[PDB]
């Protein structure tokens, strides 16, 4: 990092207005149908969203006990933006270490906790359930069969990308990126706060982004300087943020923080979803960092549309039968 992250936090130049502040009750399927979920949204309170969070003083040690001391967790080395691995108990020890005693800055942004005890303590906005491709398109008997609580790909029966716990110490920074597969993201500040720099997915900015990734010079160039327009915005405790497909964003953590969030594909911005996927392909992102079973999901999406509209199934007999049995529960 040869740019000064402190001036990027102090300057007033990232003054675009992209985010809409909304009340939870107006975030519904009609709103999505009319707008296509094209605008980043902040919900300053959770009234009307249908979320559920754990107890407000929930700690990292509580997360640890819910997912298991021995769960392997991907950790990001902030200085390099590379990954390492440790146990949740090891992560917890690092997180409980006083700031002055931590050798390096590490961030956990990728702890997917579906099928652990923590799962029922967190519920995402209701409207998301109505439009998530996982919930609405993936064969239900496959989803229900998942037993593995890690993101081990050989055990994964569906795209396990719905509920993530992020645990970030003061000073953490995640450099500019687009969330995997062109997913949209909901993000709830349970405790602490985050600062986002937001860059819109115009064709020009997405070319800059790809070029910046292909250059390998991401430590040298702050991308938010290279673009047409960028909003820097602070999310405070209790806010819920929705990020549309394709938005290029970087994040700074000004205080120790705990976040619950998750990813979803939906039927209202498919072109952008595909566009992001093709940037991943061209910049050679390893499959580990991508949306699992992406094209598979897309096939199932086509089938559901055909079936729901025409009543003609393109599922195997056996999958039709599995679906019929579930309709009768």
């Amino acid at each position: 990092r040869t740019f000064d992250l402190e001036e990027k936090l102090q300057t007033n130049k990232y003054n675009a207005n992209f985010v809409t502040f909304m009340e939870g009750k107006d975030f519904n399927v009609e709103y999505i149908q009319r707008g296509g979920l094209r605008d980043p949204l902040i919900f300053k309170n959770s009234d009307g969203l249908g979320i559920k969070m754990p107890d407000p003083d929930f700690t990292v040690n509580d997360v640890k006990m819910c997912v298991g001391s021995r769960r392997m967790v991907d950790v990001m080395d902030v200085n390099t933006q590379k990954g390492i691995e440790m146990t949740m108990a090891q992560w917890t020890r690092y997180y409980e270490t006083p700031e002055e005693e931590r050798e390096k800055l590490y961030n956990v942004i990728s702890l997917e906790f579906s099928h652990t005890r923590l799962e029922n303590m967190v519920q995402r906005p209701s409207t998301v359930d109505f439009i998530d491709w996982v919930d609405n398109m993936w064969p239900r008997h496959l989803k229900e069969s998942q037993t593995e609580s890690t993101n081990a790909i050989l055990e994964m029966q569906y795209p396990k990308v719905q509920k993530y716990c992020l645990m970030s110490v003061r000073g953490c920074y995640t450099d500019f990126h687009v969330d995997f597969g062109g997913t949209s993201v909901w993000y709830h500040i349970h405790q602490g706060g985050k600062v986002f720099w937001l860059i819109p997915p115009t064709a020009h900015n997405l070319e800059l982004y790809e070029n910046w990734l292909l250059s390998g010079k991401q430590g040298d160039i702050f991308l938010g300087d290279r673009v047409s327009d960028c909003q820097r915005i602070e999310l405070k405790q209790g806010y819920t943020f929705v990020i549309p497909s394709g938005w290029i964003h970087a994040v700074y953590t000004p205080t120790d923080t705990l976040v619950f969030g998750g990813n979803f594909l939906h039927s209202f911005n498919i072109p952008m979803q595909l566009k992001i996927y093709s940037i991943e392909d061209r910049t050679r992102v390893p499959n580990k960092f991508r949306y699992p079973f992406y094209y598979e999901m897309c096939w199932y999406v086509l089938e559901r549309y055909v079936y729901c509209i025409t009543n003609r199934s393109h599922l195997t007999k056996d999958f039709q039968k599995e679906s019929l049995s579930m309709d009768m529960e």
Binding site: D74, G83, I153, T174, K288, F289, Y291
Partner: peptide, 11 residues
Amino acid sequence: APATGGVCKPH
């Protein structure tokens, strides 16, 4: 090591 999927990280 077993392969994983759905890991959030830049680059």
